Design an enzyme around this catalytic site. Structure first.
Site, PDB file in Angstrom:
ATOM      1  N   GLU A  35       0.819  -1.225   0.000  1.00 46.47           N
ATOM      2  CA  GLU A  35       0.000   0.000   0.000  1.00 46.47           C
ATOM      3  C   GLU A  35       0.846   1.266   0.000  1.00 46.47           C
ATOM      4  O   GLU A  35       0.604   2.189  -0.772  1.00 46.47           O
ATOM      5  CB  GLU A  35      -0.987   0.042   1.157  1.00 46.47           C
ATOM      6  CG  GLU A  35      -2.221  -0.870   1.068  1.00 46.47           C
ATOM      7  CD  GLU A  35      -3.133  -0.520  -0.094  1.00 46.47           C
ATOM      8  OE1 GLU A  35      -3.067   0.514  -0.738  1.00 46.47           O
ATOM      9  OE2 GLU A  35      -4.003  -1.387  -0.345  1.00 46.47           O
ATOM     10  N   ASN A  46      -7.280   9.868  -5.558  1.00 50.20           N
ATOM     11  CA  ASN A  46      -8.133   9.001  -6.411  1.00 50.20           C
ATOM     12  C   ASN A  46      -8.904   9.832  -7.422  1.00 50.20           C
ATOM     13  O   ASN A  46      -9.004  11.056  -7.289  1.00 50.20           O
ATOM     14  CB  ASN A  46      -9.037   8.171  -5.494  1.00 50.20           C
ATOM     15  CG  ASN A  46      -8.266   7.347  -4.485  1.00 50.20           C
ATOM     16  OD1 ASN A  46      -8.377   7.436  -3.266  1.00 50.20           O
ATOM     17  ND2 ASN A  46      -7.451   6.464  -5.041  1.00 50.20           N
ATOM     18  N   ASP A  48     -12.117  10.002  -7.884  1.00 49.31           N
ATOM     19  CA  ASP A  48     -13.297  10.585  -7.257  1.00 49.31           C
ATOM     20  C   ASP A  48     -12.933  11.803  -6.399  1.00 49.31           C
ATOM     21  O   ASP A  48     -13.893  12.290  -5.736  1.00 49.31           O
ATOM     22  CB  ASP A  48     -14.068   9.556  -6.438  1.00 49.31           C
ATOM     23  CG  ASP A  48     -13.384   9.085  -5.193  1.00 49.31           C
ATOM     24  OD1 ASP A  48     -12.304   9.532  -4.804  1.00 49.31           O
ATOM     25  OD2 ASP A  48     -13.926   8.204  -4.497  1.00 49.31           O
ATOM     26  N   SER A  50     -11.112  11.911  -3.669  1.00 50.05           N
ATOM     27  CA  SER A  50     -10.753  11.456  -2.324  1.00 50.05           C
ATOM     28  C   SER A  50      -9.226  11.198  -2.316  1.00 50.05           C
ATOM     29  O   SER A  50      -8.638  11.186  -3.404  1.00 50.05           O
ATOM     30  CB  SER A  50     -11.515  10.211  -1.941  1.00 50.05           C
ATOM     31  OG  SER A  50     -11.074   9.072  -2.631  1.00 50.05           O
ATOM     32  N   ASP A  52      -5.867   8.826  -0.318  1.00 48.52           N
ATOM     33  CA  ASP A  52      -5.501   7.718   0.580  1.00 48.52           C
ATOM     34  C   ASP A  52      -4.220   8.171   1.331  1.00 48.52           C
ATOM     35  O   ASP A  52      -3.329   8.733   0.729  1.00 48.52           O
ATOM     36  CB  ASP A  52      -5.335   6.379  -0.081  1.00 48.52           C
ATOM     37  CG  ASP A  52      -6.417   6.061  -1.088  1.00 48.52           C
ATOM     38  OD1 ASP A  52      -7.614   6.259  -0.888  1.00 48.52           O
ATOM     39  OD2 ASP A  52      -6.037   5.594  -2.184  1.00 48.52           O
ATOM     40  N   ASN A  59      -8.579   5.816   3.043  1.00 47.93           N
ATOM     41  CA  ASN A  59      -9.309   6.731   2.166  1.00 47.93           C
ATOM     42  C   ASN A  59     -10.141   7.814   2.824  1.00 47.93           C
ATOM     43  O   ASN A  59     -10.918   7.511   3.734  1.00 47.93           O
ATOM     44  CB  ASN A  59     -10.183   5.856   1.247  1.00 47.93           C
ATOM     45  CG  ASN A  59     -10.781   6.638   0.096  1.00 47.93           C
ATOM     46  OD1 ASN A  59     -11.996   6.868   0.115  1.00 47.93           O
ATOM     47  ND2 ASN A  59     -10.035   7.085  -0.900  1.00 47.93           N
ATOM     48  N   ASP A 101     -15.698  -3.761   9.091  1.00 46.26           N
ATOM     49  CA  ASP A 101     -16.745  -3.240   8.233  1.00 46.26           C
ATOM     50  C   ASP A 101     -17.522  -4.296   7.481  1.00 46.26           C
ATOM     51  O   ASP A 101     -18.608  -3.868   6.992  1.00 46.26           O
ATOM     52  CB  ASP A 101     -16.237  -2.140   7.301  1.00 46.26           C
ATOM     53  CG  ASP A 101     -17.285  -1.124   6.913  1.00 46.26           C
ATOM     54  OD1 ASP A 101     -18.049  -0.687   7.809  1.00 46.26           O
ATOM     55  OD2 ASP A 101     -17.415  -0.742   5.726  1.00 46.26           O
TER      56      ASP A 101
END
EC number: 3.2.1.17
Length: 129
Positions: A35, A46, A48, A50, A52, A59, A101
């Site tokens: 990562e 990203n 969109d 957003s 990370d 995110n 989650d």
């Protein structure tokens, strides 16, 4: 801070990640390797809008507040910048929420594509744990 493989393994364990939600420590170190290459200051934007952040590339769409991701959640209740620190506590705290989650570690795309079903025990070999 750029962590060493074993240094991070020990920091992770110390923070309650070994077998957290059934995921052995090897999975957590493998995820961090792919990562962010063990760099707490890693960031990636990203499509969109957003971003990370940190070692686990958490995110901004759902987990932290960066003040620039319109109508995103802050499920971990922290500023995203807290995720870039040398101290991995906030990154690990937030990770525990994410993994719980429903999708488990599949929440991390590099885990899914590069760690899942591989000999993850290799990531902790030779370490004094």
């Amino acid at each position: 801070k750029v962590f060493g493989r074993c240094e991070l393994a020990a920091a992770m364990k110390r923070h309650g990640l070994d077998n957290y939600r059934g995921y052995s420590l090897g999975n957590w170190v493998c995820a961090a390797k792919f990562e962010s290459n063990f760099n707490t200051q890693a960031t990636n934007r990203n499509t969109d809008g957003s971003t990370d952040y940190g070692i686990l590339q958490i995110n901004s769409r759902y987990w932290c507040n960066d003040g620039r991701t319109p109508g995103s959640r802050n499920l971990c209740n922290i500023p995203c910048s807290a995720l870039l620190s040398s101290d991995i506590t906030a990154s690990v705290n937030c990770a525990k929420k994410i993994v719980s989650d429903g999708n488990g570690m599949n929440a991390w795309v590099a885990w899914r594509n590069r760690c899942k079903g591989t000999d993850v025990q290799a990531w902790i070999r030779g370490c004094r744990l």
